[PDB]
Sequence to fold (145 residues):
Amino acid sequence: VAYWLVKSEPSVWSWDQQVAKGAAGEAWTGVRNHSAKLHMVAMRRGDRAFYYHSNEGKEIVGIAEIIREAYPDPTDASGKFVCVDIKADKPLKTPVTLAAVKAEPRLADMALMKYSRLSVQPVTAEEWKLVCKMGGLLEHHHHHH
Fold:
């Protein structure tokens, strides 16, 4: 149960595409990048990541959750690679563009602003909270009185 950030291109994998697969889940397979793999090994069921659209959009539009432990990638018959199942939990009210990330000096020191080439990034509680809150995810019906 940690916070991560995954980069997906809408031409390959769209948002609605994953929303319609919310209760289904998709296996993040074919990860030949060992850095991303290493981070995904730390992932367990309940871990949550930022669904960031790369290439087209360059914006975080929703929250994804891991719904299966890191198991050997079905593409590899030696168990040399692993994969987890991701789902769409809920989207953000305001999409967090990379430009918006640049607008916050605090998030300007996040891995997202350091290594755009890094697919799967680690996010801490405060970073997670800040970005979500920055994306208009201020659910405040907790009190009207």
In short: The chain has one domain: 1-145. The helical segments are 15-19, 34-42, 98-103, 111-114, 125-134. DSSP finds five helices and six strands in the chain. The two ends are 33 Å apart (CA to CA).
